[PDB]
Enzyme design. Structure first.
Site, PDB file in Angstrom:
ATOM      1  N   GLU A  35       0.858  -1.225   0.000  1.00  0.00           N
ATOM      2  CA  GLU A  35       0.000   0.000   0.000  1.00  0.00           C
ATOM      3  C   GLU A  35       0.864   1.234   0.000  1.00  0.00           C
ATOM      4  O   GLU A  35       0.574   2.219  -0.678  1.00  0.00           O
ATOM      5  CB  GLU A  35      -0.925  -0.034   1.181  1.00  0.00           C
ATOM      6  N   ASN A  46      -7.607   8.500  -5.768  1.00  0.00           N
ATOM      7  CA  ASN A  46      -8.396   7.488  -6.483  1.00  0.00           C
ATOM      8  C   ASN A  46      -9.229   8.114  -7.593  1.00  0.00           C
ATOM      9  O   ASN A  46      -9.533   9.302  -7.609  1.00  0.00           O
ATOM     10  CB  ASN A  46      -9.313   6.779  -5.501  1.00  0.00           C
ATOM     11  N   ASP A  48     -12.370   7.831  -8.223  1.00  0.00           N
ATOM     12  CA  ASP A  48     -13.662   8.346  -7.779  1.00  0.00           C
ATOM     13  C   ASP A  48     -13.577   9.746  -7.109  1.00  0.00           C
ATOM     14  O   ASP A  48     -14.612  10.341  -6.750  1.00  0.00           O
ATOM     15  CB  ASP A  48     -14.376   7.297  -6.907  1.00  0.00           C
ATOM     16  N   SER A  50     -11.868  10.381  -4.317  1.00  0.00           N
ATOM     17  CA  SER A  50     -11.396  10.203  -2.940  1.00  0.00           C
ATOM     18  C   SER A  50      -9.851  10.043  -2.994  1.00  0.00           C
ATOM     19  O   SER A  50      -9.216   9.986  -4.047  1.00  0.00           O
ATOM     20  CB  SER A  50     -12.055   8.983  -2.291  1.00  0.00           C
ATOM     21  N   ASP A  52      -6.465   8.159  -0.721  1.00  0.00           N
ATOM     22  CA  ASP A  52      -5.973   7.202   0.284  1.00  0.00           C
ATOM     23  C   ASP A  52      -4.803   7.733   1.055  1.00  0.00           C
ATOM     24  O   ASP A  52      -3.933   8.419   0.481  1.00  0.00           O
ATOM     25  CB  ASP A  52      -5.515   5.933  -0.427  1.00  0.00           C
ATOM     26  N   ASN A  59      -9.110   5.229   2.883  1.00  0.00           N
ATOM     27  CA  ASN A  59      -9.789   6.236   2.067  1.00  0.00           C
ATOM     28  C   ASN A  59     -10.656   7.287   2.745  1.00  0.00           C
ATOM     29  O   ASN A  59     -11.134   7.216   3.904  1.00  0.00           O
ATOM     30  CB  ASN A  59     -10.521   5.621   0.856  1.00  0.00           C
TER      31      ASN A  59
END
Ligand SMILES: [Cl-]
Ligand SMILES: [Cl-]
Ligand SMILES: [Yb+3]
Ligand SMILES: [Yb+3]
Ligand SMILES: [Yb+3]
Length: 129
Positions: A35, A46, A48, A50, A52, A59
């Protein structure tokens, strides 16, 4: 902070992640490796809209508030900036809620694709735990 492998394993254990929801320490370390490369300051946008945050790439749509993600539920009740701190407590607390949410560690797509079913014990090799 960029953790060393064994240093992060020790921190995760100290914060009660070892075998949390049945997931051994090596699963958590492997997830963090892919990650964030063990970097608490990692952030990634991301598709969409959002973002992380942190060692486990939590998120801002479901879990933390960043002020720029419409529909934010903030289920961890934490500014997303808290997940970038050198101290991993906020990330660990939130990850415990995530992994408890029904799909276990499949919540982390990188865990599913890179760690699940592998020799995750390798991630804690040599560490003084
Ligand atoms: Cl393990
Ligand atoms: Cl599970
Ligand atoms: Yb991501
Ligand atoms: Yb501290
Ligand atoms: Yb021990």
């Amino acid at each position: 902070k960029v953790f060393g492998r064994c240093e992060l394993a020790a921190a995760m254990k100290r914060h009660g992640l070892d075998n949390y929801r049945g997931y051994s320490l090596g699963n958590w370390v492997c997830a963090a490796k892919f990650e964030s490369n063990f970097n608490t300051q990692a952030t990634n946008r991301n598709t969409d809209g959002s973002t992380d945050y942190g060692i486990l790439q939590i998120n801002s749509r479901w879990w933390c508030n960043d002020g720029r993600t419409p529909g934010s539920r903030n289920l961890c009740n934490i500014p997303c900036s808290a997940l970038l701190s050198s101290d991993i407590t906020a990330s660990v607390n939130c990850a415990k809620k995530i992994v408890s949410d029904g799909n276990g560690m499949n919540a982390w797509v990188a865990w599913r694709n890179r760690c699940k079913g592998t020799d995750v014990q390798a991630w804690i090799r040599g560490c003084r735990l």
